[PDB]
Amino acid sequence: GSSGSSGEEIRKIPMFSSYNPGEPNKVLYLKNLSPRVTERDLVSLFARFQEKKGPPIQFRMMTGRMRGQAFITFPNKEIAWQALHLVNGYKLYGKILVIEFGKNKKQRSSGPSSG
Secondary structure: OOOOOOOOOOOOOOOOOOOOOOOOOOEEEEEOOOOOOOHHHHHHHOHHHHHOOOOOOEEEEEOOOOOOEEEEEOOOHHHHHHHHHHOOOOEOOOOEOEEEEOOOOOOOOOOOOOO
């Protein structure tokens, strides 16, 4: 009975990579936050960016039937992403924070602009 058996949970996945962020956007979607977590935490988490070049960073906390989620709006997608990959999986209050990217919704198909 020599070594050999390996991967009880993993069905030999080509890449046992955790969740995927996808495309980098300006709006981020943070989840896995303990009922204790508050805006303050978010601020400090992405505070270094606040001062960084670019308009003040906006933070939003969700408190619906199911708490443990929040959204942060950065000056642009570039900055937003950077912060994500940086704070990707930040253990807080014994919780694995999961940062994601928003999406494009409620858009208009008009444009009076001229050239």
